[PDB]
Every structure is written in structure tokens, then in C-alpha cells.
Design a protein around this ligand. Structure first.
Ligand SMILES: CC(=O)N[C@@H]1[C@@H](O)[C@H](O[C@@H]2O[C@H](CO)[C@H](O)[C@H](O[C@]3(C(=O)O)C[C@H](O)[C@@H](NC(C)=O)[C@H]([C@H](O)[C@H](O)CO)O3)[C@H]2O)[C@@H](CO)O[C@H]1O
Ligand SMILES: CC(=O)N[C@@H]1[C@@H](O)[C@H](O[C@@H]2O[C@H](CO)[C@H](O)[C@H](O[C@]3(C(=O)O)C[C@H](O)[C@@H](NC(C)=O)[C@H]([C@H](O)[C@H](O)CO)O3)[C@H]2O)[C@@H](CO)O[C@H]1O
Ligand SMILES: *[C@@H]1O[C@H](CO)[C@@H](O[C@@H]2O[C@H](CO)[C@@H](O)[C@H](O)[C@H]2NC(C)=O)[C@H](O)[C@H]1NC(C)=O
Ligand SMILES: *[C@@H]1O[C@H](CO)[C@@H](O[C@@H]2O[C@H](CO)[C@@H](O)[C@H](O)[C@H]2NC(C)=O)[C@H](O)[C@H]1NC(C)=O
Ligand SMILES: CC(=O)N[C@@H]1[C@@H](O)[C@H](O[C@@H]2O[C@H](CO)[C@H](O)[C@H](O)[C@H]2O)[C@@H](CO)O[C@H]1O
Ligand SMILES: CC(=O)N[C@H]1[C@H]([C@H](O)[C@H](O)CO)O[C@@](O)(C(=O)O)C[C@@H]1O
Ligand SMILES: *[C@@H]1O[C@H](CO)[C@@H](O)[C@H](O)[C@H]1NC(C)=O
Ligand SMILES: *[C@@H]1O[C@H](CO)[C@@H](O)[C@H](O)[C@H]1NC(C)=O
Ligand SMILES: *[C@@H]1O[C@H](CO)[C@@H](O)[C@H](O)[C@H]1NC(C)=O
Ligand SMILES: *[C@@H]1O[C@H](CO)[C@@H](O)[C@H](O)[C@H]1NC(C)=O
Ligand SMILES: *[C@@H]1O[C@H](CO)[C@@H](O)[C@H](O)[C@H]1NC(C)=O
Ligand SMILES: *[C@@H]1O[C@H](CO)[C@@H](O)[C@H](O)[C@H]1NC(C)=O
Ligand SMILES: *[C@@H]1O[C@H](CO)[C@@H](O)[C@H](O)[C@H]1NC(C)=O
Ligand SMILES: *[C@@H]1O[C@H](CO)[C@@H](O)[C@H](O)[C@H]1NC(C)=O
Ligand SMILES: *[C@@H]1O[C@H](CO)[C@@H](O)[C@H](O)[C@H]1NC(C)=O
Lengths: 486, 486, 487
């Protein structure tokens, strides 16, 4: 007859690290790092994104002859663009303030194209010869579909003076361009006026431009250039145009309502018809964990990016007729702490749910607190700087590197500390049980020093159950123990 | 005859949360979050801020007729401006590099207005006709008070050549502008010359401008525009002007001395005859606490911004014929740990001074270290970007959000873990007292197991005080205890 | 006759601070803050930096006459420049996009100067009179050595048209400028053309410029101005020039290959002929500690910057023949951390326990090594490159630096204090464990004096004492002896 105190053990082989030891085996463990994704593009909060395929924002807006597929998108949440678009600008040139326009057009609540100036509004100018071989369409020269290129008619170029009243209830996006010739002979052949100018004016815009005739290298077989501009028109504002040559008039305008912000996404993966909350260039994330290591660039409410490859929290016990000093019992299955009973009546294991419940609740509460004490908010990450803005890009890189280092260090140190804290908490609990059963039986038995007590007298199964309950009668067997001694 | 060990208890109801349990009840607690403000604008380190009421910086500088009376306030620390100023640029137009001037005019010492070019310096030009209905004054047309609008005289407009030494010992701020006409007839009516230009040159400035004549939408009944410029003149530099029309000449200049930097606050709160160290748009704060949740935008030496609503540290014990493991003692005032005594003379309470003093010192040191290990620096937070710089604004927002998240997470985790440690720090000392008295007692008494010892022999008040002091004589009562043992 | 427990103590006077106490004396301690530097400028990863001495970047590129140090360094890691260079621009003027060019002129893999337009290519223009007193050389007027100032010849200025087709296999850097006159008479005397223009065009460049004639202040005795421009030419592109006056044609071009990125250091320290890994304007840092307080501006893989002056991590014992619960100043034990002091008729000695000491030292070493090693360090170049009209971005960067500094300082100090508190308990727990292990083996054969010793009733000699240290004790052997000794 003897009674011993031990702890649960199993065949688990999971390993964790503490501040002082490394590769400590535990019975149970939990991971708090996310490392998986679905590998597809899916909707953000029920709003389908916009996919431009092989086109670009400028080509889509200006109406490139090879990018007319996209004509119906009521709204979108973010824009997906290929890293190296093929069809961007058939005619060589540039667009002013491209990056700001892209950032503004990132997220649009409502989008619709309307016609503001019919082609019949130019009786004294030719509107059918404005084509070039640099913009082929089905093997024939063509031009942008959203603008019209005006040339002289009957060897005359009368001055142009028109204005537009905005009568719609939303803002309008308008684009126009100017063409640079190559030499004086070409300028005379195209516009008949050696000197030309363009004047554009609104309630807040005041612009005046002149052509720049010079010699330039060939791009796409053309030496000329075209520069385009854009503006936003108020609901009750008006815009006035005036020019006498080298003018590319607008034909279509876009009705735009903006009530949010986002960024532009560079990826090559395909659509997947899902709904998600966080999006990455290589897939989507559906995890509640506070840390991840998938990709730096993310859109939406996402966990924090860290460098570490493993963050495991220890939740179980230290894996390994005896006692708690030697090791953990394998015969016990229910509970974490308990007693192994043994006498002439029988043998077996009995668990102590009172402390096991407290330990389980404490561990679960710690894990839940660590997971849920993190605050997240909507964010958009991307690269939105051109060649001549390297300093700001370097500053942003400093931002990201510093934040990454801070988060990595904090997470690693927190995990390393908490593992050891949990282990010593378990040791304290088992020792508390051991001296709880102590100080009650008194001198009726002796402690072998291995975590067990050998009763001098005979303690029945009811007596042992009462001992487990915490109620024991010492004078009942005091005399039996006394004459048992020696 | 028995001696028992216990701890303090009271009628408190404060609650604190640990890493394992939520709102256990404690006797005493302290808050380390600031949530109060006076709701008024105070001076910053004894320096009056600048309040523009219903004006704007450009309107105040240029001298809008309905806006400014006179300068006052030779020095200031920061500028308070309303969200939507009413009087600003009565004549439609714009000011070049407005944001840079706004930022540079934040904190200024010895700001004084002087006159450089008297109106008598224009004998061949008209100076009393430059008025417009767009800037009325007491029901009559007027103009800006700091500049002069020049008109042709006797149907002529001779060329203007003027230069100015800066003989003063401080930097000088000068402003000028150019006017855009509407048509050729209006240009001829205002100035004889049909083609005009403006040339401005200093040791580091080289500018040449020409008017732009076009059709624009009317604002405030005027279709014209005026653009203004500014520059800083060195203490021994000179500035040269040259124009032949469409020239707005300066009349007054400001002597400026700058050392430091601040920002501009958008608020509507009134002044309160106050002196603070940290200022917010909704009020002023002074405190020593490391964290606050009042307003994201702050100026001065302010605590860190967090999102949490409650941050409470525990500085006491766990609240709830007795013993250690029963609960607290309501009846024993004046102490944290102590002994309850009961002999045949009577019963009462006594406290251990040394352990209580040590615990109080430790808790106070912990709280003071947590509060005082924080480093504070002067900072100015505000929004200083226009509509065409959205990317930098997004970068600043990412800045602020990341810092807020880091601080919130760190503060919450630290508070929880320190509460955990402090809550069970006291149990070690109480256990130490218990086994200390048990060690001195040895086997002269019997342990009831609830935290007391039943004395076999008689222990008078002198003996009881000796036991508390730590001077017990085992051989004195050993024989009596042996006889009583049977 | 008795056995006692204690711990090692010595004569060290190191002091550490915990969360609850201050001025705590410890036996051993280790610092994790770096505060020393060699005070020299040394190479970065075997690549010698570029030292410009008293010449600025613009003067070095344009070929200032007073910067005759035409030493060739094919590859450099970073640029060292004085705070206030003296020889910058002999002729007053400005350089467009100066800051971007300076940023791009950081670490360069390959650099070489070649001639693209010989002076013989101007038969109808004068190329020998383009000198000024503002650029002296050995007491004579001179000009920049990389550009040519063209003047009218035979009272005529024919229009200039030229192109250059890039046959090299690397990118090319080209610079050109335009001169502003003072009045109509000077313009007529210099170029004979009242109205002039400059046209430059490449596959991606389209620029047109016109002179601005006005009255300006006198700088270096000259009232004129000169504005310069730069561009990058692709390996198979060409550049076309066209002007009729006020033109400064290029003569030499730079052939450049760029791979990485760096910044510019402002310092006055001398060269040191080293090979370091982290650089600082006041010296070089050679250390593995995670924190330092030398200088905010650094280049390369460097530790974090904090405002603290001391960061000491406790790794020893509480410094101050009975011990265990009274002062454990056992100066006799000099061979371990925990042990026993024994005494009987044969003699006395200070034995030590190897297992507990090994466990404690392994744990402390693992803690210190983990704290030191769990640092992520990446290459970062920190500088201050912003002009007078970009103060807002500079303020943003300053806020960045201040916030990061505050976060790191607070975290480091709190971690150090808390870890010292944690470490100052493990030793006491080990001592207590050893004490109870010593107990429950003698049971009732000895009297626990409570001062930290046990006094055996029976007679135990050196062999029995060694056995009880070994963990093997024969209780029944001396049970009857303890019984008869008990009164
Ligand atoms: C060896 C020889 O003589 N070869 C010529 C060959 O050079 C010539 O090419 C024409 O060259 C001009 C440049 O001087 C243009 O590039 C012509 O291109 C087109 C185009 O882009 O399709 C023709 C088109 O009709 C034009 N459109 C309008 C609205 O005017 C445009 C336009 O002029 C330019 O783009 C303006 O910059 O140019 C190109 O064909 C050919 C002519 O066919 O003849 C060979 O013999
Ligand atoms: C139905 C009808 O015929 N109504 C006219 C009415 O249009 C006309 O108005 C004047 O209109 C002109 C535009 O053509 C200007 O807007 C006049 O404005 C003033 C002003 O701002 O007060 C007059 C002032 O004297 C001018 N100041 C100077 C220094 O020259 C300025 C100046 O010309 C402009 O601001 C330059 O852009 O304009 C406005 O009064 C009136 C004329 O009284 O007659 C009605 O019959
Ligand atoms: C901690 O105290 C709060 C009381 O402030 C308890 O939270 C309340 O829970 C009830 C129902 O469970 C809700 O109806 C209240 O709205 C809660 N109060 C607040 C302020 O949210 C909470 O239960 C306590 N903690 C635990 C573990 O019981
Ligand atoms: C503005 O006036 C000052 C003072 O008269 C001029 O500085 C003087 O210049 C003359 C000749 O240039 C010197 O002889 C004096 O010694 C200078 N005086 C001082 C106090 O420096 C200055 O030149 C004038 N401005 C300009 C543009 O010439
Ligand atoms: C008072 C006077 O007439 N002085 C002139 C000098 O100005 C002149 O020096 C030349 O001045 C021009 C400016 O007009 C220019 O700066 C030349 O570079 C400079 O050499 C000098 C010529 O030798 O003659 C004096 O009489
Ligand atoms: C090439 C030339 O004409 N150089 C002359 C210059 C220029 O006239 C001015 O610097 C133009 O502003 O002036 C002087 C000088 O600086 O020595 C005399 C010199 O002969
Ligand atoms: C800890 O375990 C891992 C996994 O097997 C192993 O790679 C590593 O070397 C171990 N560490 C030590 C110090 O042995
Ligand atoms: C545009 O038309 C509306 C409708 O009459 C009018 O109110 C508005 O003034 C017009 N815009 C301008 C600039 O006159
Ligand atoms: C995400 O995962 C959860 C399980 O963790 C699953 O129930 C859910 O359907 C998944 N998808 C979404 C959109 O939440
Ligand atoms: C708690 O007890 C103190 C001690 O007298 C008393 O002053 C206080 O009012 C009591 N509080 C409550 C809520 O009863
Ligand atoms: C903070 O404000 C209070 C007024 O509510 C004032 O009594 C206190 O003295 C202030 N703090 C300091 C340091 O002056
Ligand atoms: C401390 O002890 C060491 C070890 O012998 C000795 O070398 C050193 O000189 C001592 N220091 C002092 C100040 O006595
Ligand atoms: C701790 O030591 C320093 C250094 O000698 C001393 O200045 C400081 O006052 C000490 N702390 C206390 C509380 O005395
Ligand atoms: C430069 O030379 C190559 C060599 O054939 C030629 O193909 C290329 O067209 C030339 N560049 C230009 C702009 O013509
Ligand atoms: C860096 O410090 C270590 C440690 O003393 C030394 O061995 C090494 O030589 C140092 N490196 C250089 C380049 O001096």
C-alpha cells in the first residue's frame, strides 16, 4: 500500500524553446504563425476588383485600339495590373501626373462614360484623316477612340472657340492633348499656321501651351510626340477651350464618384471567384493569427509581417509506481494531475479535476489574450514612385524595414519568455498538490522521498477516497500506526 | 492558544485583469492612462499663440480689407486657424508655394512690418485707380493694403526700373504679383503696351513672367486672375524689378527672425489665459502618465497615443479564528501581513513591519520605474499637404497607424504581465513568514493545517512577543510539551 | 558533526538594477551596450570610399580648375564630403536636380571618363576665348575642363546641328548648359543674334530653353548666370542638339554602371586603411552587441541606436561557517557556485556540487546568447538629403527617427530591468531545492538548527559525509545510534 502523485504523459514529439533551454519536448503545443494561402485573386468585402490584363491605365483611359475589351465595370475595389503591360501608348508620348491619376483612380464608387462633344461640332475642320500607322487596327491605321485629331480643311484652319457647361450632378474627368511636329514643312502641311497656341481655362485651371518643333529619335517608327493632360470638373462649372492648331480635342468624358482609397496591385495570378478580407500578390489569407510571413505587400486588414519561420507556444506538460520526481505516468489518460492508488484491494489511477480545470482555463485564457490583444486596421501597401523620386522610396523602405525588425524581435522574445513561464507554472501546480496532500496525513505514514507515502496502518478504499476528498481521520488509525512503528 | 497568519482586507471594489484571469478583485490599484483635459487653449511655455479668427494666412499677409486691422504679437509659438476661413483672397487667384510659406511661418520671433517703397516713388504712373468691387470696404471698392496696382497715366506706361538695398540687419520678406487680363481690348484699356513682361532678379533669384490672356469662368463676378510670389532677402542683398505692364508692386515688407519649428492647428476652441506644456485641438493636458487617448494630433511634450480605454495596475492584495488559506482579515487595520494572537489573557491582532515595508517599497519602485523609464521629445503633428500630394499623406497615415498599433500592443501586454507578477509576489513573502514561524516553533505545538499552530503548553504575552520577535527557547517548555503529549 | 549549505561569494563591486531594487551588488555582470570606436574612416567590405577633399560633387563633375586632382577610382562604396566645401562653382549659377544626381552618384560599380566631341568639331565657331576671371588658374582666366563655351567667329554665329550615336555597351552621362547675358549690347557682342534658343531631344527627352536677360546682383564679380542640365543615355540611343547662341556644348562624358545604393557622409576624419562593416561620421564600429549610442547617422549593418548610458545584465550572484538562510559570503568556496561546507573530527572543507553549477551556468549563458543573437540586421544607409524648399519631408523623416529611437530605448530598458529581476531568483530557487534535497535523507538522525546546518546525533565521518553528498545514506545503520543519542 502506497499513494503517489504524478502527471499526464503521452507519445507526443512536439518541441518548443525557452529562454534557458532549447529543444524541450511537450505534450501539446499551438502555432500562432500563418504560412498558407489559397493562391488566387478573390473579391474584397464583396466588391469585385478590376483586371486590366495586358493593358495599362493610360491605354485603357485614352481608348487604345487594342484595349477596347473593358467597357463595363460599374465599380471596383482595387486594380490588378501586369508588371510589364504590352499595349500602353501606341503613339509615343507621355501623360502628365500619371501617378496621382492612378492613385486617385485606385478605388472608385461609380464610373460611367458619356459623350460631351459630338463629331458633328466641327463643320470647318477635317475629322477623318487623323490616323497613324503607329496605332494599327485590323491591319489599318487608326487612333485613340476617346479623342479626335483635327487637321486643316480646304487649306484653312479657323480658330476654335467652344465651351461646355457641366449639367450632371457628379464630377467629370476630361482629357486633352497637344501634338509636337517635326519641322516647319510638316507644320505647314498639317495646320497651315507657322505659330500656334492652346489655351484652356476653368474656375481653377489656367493653362497655355505651345508646340516644340525639334528633332528626336525614332520610337515605334515615329518622330513626333503627344502630351496629354487631365482635370476634374465641378458639378456646376464650365470649361473653355481655344486653339489654332496642334490641338487634340476630347470626345468622351467619365462620370466619377470617389468615396475611398486603395492602391494598384502588380500580379499575374488569375481570378478565383471568392470573398476574402486580406489579399496578397500570391494569394489570399483567411487566418485570425496575429503574425504571418507570406508577402510584404498586402491590401486590407491583414496580420503583421515577420521574418521568423516558427512561433510555437507550449500549452501541455513536459514530456518524458514511481512519483512526480522520476517522470510522468502513461497509464493515466483523463486529466493532467492525479493520484495512482495501490493497496491489497486493487490498483488504478484517479485524477484531480479541481486543479486540472484551473490549469486548462489559465492556459486557454493566456493563449486567447495573446491572440486577441492585437488591433488591426485597413491598410494599402504598394510602390507609387517614378524614376525621379528615389529619396521618398528609400524613406518608405526605411519605414518597412524598421517596423519588420521591431515586430520580429517583440514576437520572438514574447514567445521565448511565455514558454518558460508556463513550464514553471505547471511545476508550481504539481508541487502545490504534493504539499496539499501533505500536512494532512501527519505521522500515520512515511515519505519514501520518491513522491510516495507508505501507510503504516491499513487505509480502506473508502479511506483513500476520503483522503482524496480532503477529509481524513488521523486519531482513527493513530494507535494502529503507533503499534505498527517498530 | 494558537497563532495564525493572514493578510489585509477591506471594502474596496477595484478590478484588474491578469494574463490568466479577468477582473480579480484587489484592495488597491493605480491608473496609468490620462483621459482628462481642460477644454481650452493655453500658452506654450509662456508664449502666446497666434489666433487669426475668421482670416487665413494669405489674407492676413496680403492685407485683405475686411480681415486684418494691424499686426500685433511680435512673437508667437503656433498658429490657430479655423477649418474654413471666410475672408481669404477676395480677388480670385493663387499664391505660389503656399504650403512652404505656411510651414515656415509657424514659429517666429521679432516679426515687424516696415515700409520700403513709398507711394511717392511712382510719379509717372497712376496709383489711385487700382480698386475692384470684388474687395469692397464699407460699401466701396478697395484692394489689398500691402500692395499697389499700377495703371497707365496720360495714355502712357513707361518702363519701370527700381532696385532696393536691404540696409536692415535681419532677413526681409517681400511679396509681389502679376495680373492676367481677359481680352486684348481690356489689356489696351488698362495698359498701353499690348505685350508685357516682368523681370525679377536677386543674388539667387532669376524669374521672368508673361501674362496669359484667355477666357475663364467668373468667380465673385470677376474673370481675371492674379498670381503672387514671395522670397527671402538676405541682410545685405539687393532686389531689382523691371516690367512694362501687368505689374503689382510691393509697398510693405516684414522683418523676420526664425529659430525653431512648429505647425498649424485647425480648431475652434477659444483662448483661456493659460500656461501648459502639451496642447491638443480639443484642449490642454498636463500629467505625468506615459499614455493618453485624447486626440491623435498634438504639439509639444505629450504622452504617447493609444486606443485602449482602461489601463490599471495592481498595487495590493487579492480581496475577497482564521488562517492563511481562508481569505483576508477585515478587522486587522494598519498592515499588510501580520499575526492574529489568542491566549488565555485575550485576543487581538499584530502586524509585521519589516515585510510590509519591503513590499510597499518594491511596489512603489516598480510603479515609479514603469512611469519614469519613458523618454519624451518635442514634436509637432499636423496635416500639411495639398490635393496633389496624396501619396505623401498616405505615407504619413501609415506612419501614424503603425506607431499607434505598436504602442497599444506593447502597453497592453506589459500591463497584463506586470499585474500577473505583482498579484502573486505577496504570496511568497507570506509563505516565508509561515515557514519561518514554523521553523522556530518546531514540534512544541501541532499544526491545525489551516494556517495556525495549537500550543501544547502555556505561552504568555512575553512569550508571544518573543515568538513574533524571533527569540524562542525550545528547552524551556519542551518537558511540559512532552508531558502534555500522550 | 554538522553539514551546512551556502553559495559562492567574492570581492567584486559590480552593481545592477532590478524592477524593485536599485544599487544591487552582484558577483558577475555583462554589458550589452557598445560605446567605443576607432575614430577613423575605413573601407566598407573591401571597397575604398571616395574622398573629395575640398571639392563638391558639382565641381568635381564639371571639372573645376581648382580641383586638379584627377585621380581615378573605378569603384567606390560611399562619398565623403566636407560640411562646407570651398570650391563648388567658380561661375555663379545652379545645377538642375542636384539632389537626385547626388543620390544616384552613390556606390557605383564602374566609372570612366571618355571623350565624345573633340574640339575640332567646331570649324565655324571660336573655342579659345571662352574664359572668365571668376575661374582663375595659376593667376589666369580659365573655365571648366569638361565643357566648351562657344563664341561667335568672324562676326557670325551659324546655326549648330549635331547628333551622337551611342556605340558603347554601357549607360552614358552627359551634361550641358546655357548662359544668361546681362543686356542687349552684351548679347550682341557675344552672339550677334538678338533672339536665341536651345533644343535638345532624345527618345525620352524633349527640352527647349531661351535665355533670360535681366539685371541681377553681383556675385564673384559677375552678373551673369549659368544653368546646367544632365541626362542618362541608353546603350543604343542618340541625342540631338540644336541652338543658335548661348550654348555650352559638352566635351567629355562619363560611362557608368550602377548596381546598388548608398548615401553621402559629411565628416572631416582622415582615412584609416581598415576593412570595417559599419561606418559612422566619427569612427568605425567593430562589435556584435545589439545596441549602441555613438551617432544617429550610420551606413551599413549597424546595431540599434538608443539614448541610454548603461545597460548591464546580471549573470552572477548576490554579493555581500554558516550560510543558506543567513549571509552566504562563503569566500572559502572558489571552485563552484553551490556547495557544502563540512566539519567533523577529521577536518573541514568547502565542497561543491557540479551538477547544479553546470545547470545554472548553462541557463544563464543560453539566456544571454539568445538575447544577443535574436537580432535582425539589414543594410541601411541613413543621411540628410533635402533642399531648402522641402522642409516638410525632412520633418517627416525626423519624426520617423525620433519615434524609432524612443521605442527602442524604452523596450531595451524595460527588458533589461525585467530580465535582471528574473535572473535574481533562479539562484535562490536552486539553493532552496538543494537544501530540501539535503533534507528528507537524514530524517530524524540530525537536528535542523534552522541557521542553515544540520547537526547529526550519531557519528558520521568523511566517508558517510561523502555518501550523503552522493545521495546515498543508510538510515537504519545509524537509526539506533540516533535513538540512543536522543536523551
Ligand atoms: C526613303 C524615303 O523616301 N522614305 C519615305 C518615308 O520616309 C515616308 O515616311 C512618312 O514619313 C513621315 C515623316 O516625315 C511620317 O512619319 C509618315 O507617317 C504617317 C503615319 O504615322 O502613318 C502618315 C499619316 O498620314 C500621318 N498622319 C496625319 C494625321 O497627318 C502621320 C503624321 O504625318 C506624322 O505621324 C506626324 O509626326 O504620319 C510616313 O509615312 C513615306 C511616306 O509614306 O514615304 C517613303 O518614300
Ligand atoms: C448687361 C450689361 O451691359 N452689364 C454691364 C456690366 O457688364 C459692366 O460691368 C463691368 O464689367 C467688366 C467686365 O467687362 C468688369 O468686370 C468691371 O469690373 C471692375 C471691378 O472689378 O470693379 C471695374 C473696375 O474699375 C476695374 N478696375 C480697374 C483698376 O481697372 C476692374 C477691372 O477692369 C477688372 O477687374 C480687370 O479684370 O473691373 C464691371 O464693373 C458695367 C460697367 O459698369 O456696365 C453694365 O451695363
Ligand atoms: C469583468 O467585468 C465586466 C464588468 O464590467 C464583465 O463584463 C460584463 O459582462 C456582462 C455579461 O457577461 C455584460 O452584460 C456587460 O456589458 C459586461 N460589461 C462590460 C463593461 O463590458 C466581465 O464578465 C468580467 N470578467 C469576467 C471574466 O467575468
Ligand atoms: C547696398 O549698400 C551697401 C552699403 O552701402 C553696399 O555695401 C558696400 O559696398 C561698397 C562697394 O560695393 C563697399 O565699398 C562697402 O564697404 C560696402 N559696405 C558694407 C557695409 O558692406 C552694397 O554694395 C549695396 N548693394 C549693392 C547691391 O551693391
Ligand atoms: C567703371 C568701369 O567702366 N569699369 C570697367 C570694368 O567694368 C571692365 O571690367 C569688365 O566689366 C564687364 C562688365 O561691364 C565684365 O564684367 C567683364 O568681365 C569685366 O572684365 C573693364 C574691362 O577691362 O573696364 C573698366 O573700365
Ligand atoms: C567669353 C567672354 O566674353 N568673357 C568675358 C566675360 C563675359 O563678358 C561676362 O562674364 C559675361 O557675363 O567677362 C569678363 C570676365 O569675366 O573676365 C571678361 C571676359 O573676356
Ligand atoms: C534543436 O533541434 C533542432 C531540430 O532537430 C536541431 O536542428 C537543432 O540542432 C537542435 N539544437 C541543438 C543545440 O542541438
Ligand atoms: C452652367 O449652366 C447652369 C445652368 O443654367 C448655370 O447656372 C451656370 O451658371 C452655368 N455655368 C457658368 C460657368 O456660367
Ligand atoms: C475561412 O476559414 C473558416 C474556418 O477557419 C471557414 O469557416 C470559412 O468558410 C472560410 N472562408 C471565409 C470567407 O471566411
Ligand atoms: C469603506 O470603508 C471606509 C473606512 O471607514 C469608509 O470610509 C468608506 O466610506 C467605505 N466605503 C463604502 C463604499 O462603504
Ligand atoms: C495640471 O493641471 C491641474 C489642473 O487641473 C493643476 O492643478 C496641476 O498643477 C497641473 N500640473 C502641473 C505640473 O502644474
Ligand atoms: C579581488 O580578488 C581578486 C582575486 O584574487 C584579486 O586579484 C583582486 O586584486 C581583488 N581586488 C581587490 C580590490 O582587492
Ligand atoms: C545607485 O548607484 C548610483 C551610482 O553610485 C548612485 O548615484 C545612486 O544614487 C544609487 N541609487 C540610490 C537609490 O541611491
Ligand atoms: C546607333 O547605331 C546603331 C548601329 O547600327 C543603329 O542601329 C542605331 O539606329 C543608331 N541610333 C540611332 C538613333 O539611329
Ligand atoms: C572585429 O573585432 C574582433 C573582436 O576583437 C576582431 O577579432 C576582429 O579582427 C575585428 N575586425 C577588424 C577588421 O579589426
Amino acid at each position: 500500500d502506497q499513494i503517489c502523485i504524478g502527471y499526464h504523459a503521452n507519445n507526443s514529439t512536439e518541441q518548443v524553446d525557452t529562454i534557458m533551454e532549447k529543444n524541450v519536448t511537450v505534450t501539446h503545443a499551438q502555432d500562432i504563425l500563418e504560412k498558407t494561402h489559397n493562391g488566387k485573386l478573390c473579391d474584397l468585402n464583396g466588391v469585385k476588383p478590376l483586371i486590366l490584363k495586358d493593358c495599362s491605365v493610360a491605354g485603357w483611359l485614352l481608348g487604345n485600339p487594342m484595349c477596347d475589351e473593358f467597357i463595363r465595370v460599374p465599380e471596383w475595389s482595387y486594380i490588378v495590373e501586369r508588371a510589364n503591360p504590352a499595349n500602353d501608348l501606341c503613339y509615343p508620348g507621355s501623360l502628365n501626373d500619371y501617378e496621382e491619376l492612378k492613385h486617385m483612380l485606385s478605388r472608385i464608387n461609380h464610373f460611367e462614360k458619356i459623350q460631351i462633344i459630338p463629331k458633328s461640332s466641327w463643320p470647318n475642320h477635317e475629322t477623318s484623316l487623323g490616323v497613324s500607322a503607329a496605332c494599327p487596327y485590323q491591319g489599318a491605321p487608326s487612333f485613340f477612340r476617346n479623342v479626335v485629331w483635327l487637321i486643316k480643311k480646304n487649306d484653312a484652319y479657323p480658330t476654335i472657340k467652344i465651351s461646355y457647361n457641366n449639367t450632371n450632378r457628379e464630377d467629370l474627368l476630361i482629357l486633352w492633348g497637344i501634338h509636337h511636329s517635326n519641322n516647319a514643312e510638316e507644320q505647314t502641311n498639317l495646320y497651315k499656321n507657322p505659330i500656334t497656341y492652346i489655351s484652356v481655362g476653368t474656375s481653377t485651371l489656367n493653362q497655355r501651351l505651345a508646340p516644340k518643333i525639334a528633332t528626336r529619335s525614332q520610337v515605334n517608327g515615329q518622330r513626333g510626340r503627344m502630351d496629354f493632360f487631365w482635370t476634374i470638373l465641378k458639378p456646376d462649372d464650365a470649361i473653355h477651350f481655344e486653339s489654332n492648331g496642334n490641338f487634340i480635342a476630347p470626345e468622351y468624358a467619365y462620370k466619377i464618384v470617389k468615396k475611398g482609397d486603395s492602391t494598384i496591385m502588380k500580379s499575374g495570378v488569375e481570378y478565383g471567384h471568392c470573398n476574402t478580407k486580406c489579399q496578397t500578390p500570391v494569394g489570399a489569407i483567411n487566418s485570425s493569427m496575429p503574425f504571418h510571413n507570406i508577402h510584404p505587400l498586402t491590401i486590407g486588414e491583414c496580420p503583421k509581417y515577420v521574418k521568423s519561420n516558427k512561433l510555437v507556444l507550449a500549452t501541455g506538460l513536459r514530456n518524458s509506481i514511481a512519483g512526480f520526481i522520476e517522470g510522468g505516468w502513461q497509464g493515466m489518460v483523463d486529466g493532467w494531475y492525479g493520484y495512482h492508488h495501490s493497496n491489497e484491494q486493487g490498483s488504478g489511477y484517479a485524477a484531480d479535476k479541481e486543479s486540472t480545470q484551473k490549469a486548462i482555463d489559465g492556459v486557454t485564457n493566456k493563449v486567447n489574450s495573446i491572440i486577441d490583444k492585437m488591433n488591426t486596421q485597413f491598410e494599402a501597401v504598394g510602390r507609387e514612385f517614378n524614376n525621379l523620386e528615389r529619396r521618398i522610396e528609400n524613406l518608405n523602405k526605411k519605414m518597412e524595414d524598421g517596423f519588420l525588425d521591431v515586430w520580429t524581435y517583440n514576437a520572438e522574445l514574447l514567445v521565448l519568455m511565455e514558454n518558460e513561464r508556463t513550464l514553471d507554472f505547471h511545476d508550481s501546480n504539481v508541487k502545490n498538490l504534493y504539499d496539499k496532500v501533505r500536512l494532512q496525513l501527519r505521522d500515520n505514514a512515511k515519505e519514501l522521498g520518491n513522491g510516495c507515502f507508505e501507510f503504516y496502518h491499513k487505509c480502506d478504499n473508502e479511506c483513500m477516497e476520503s483522503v482524496r476528498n480532503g477529509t481524513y481521520d488521523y486519531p482513527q488509525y493513530s494507535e494502529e500506526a503507533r503499534l505498527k512503528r517498530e
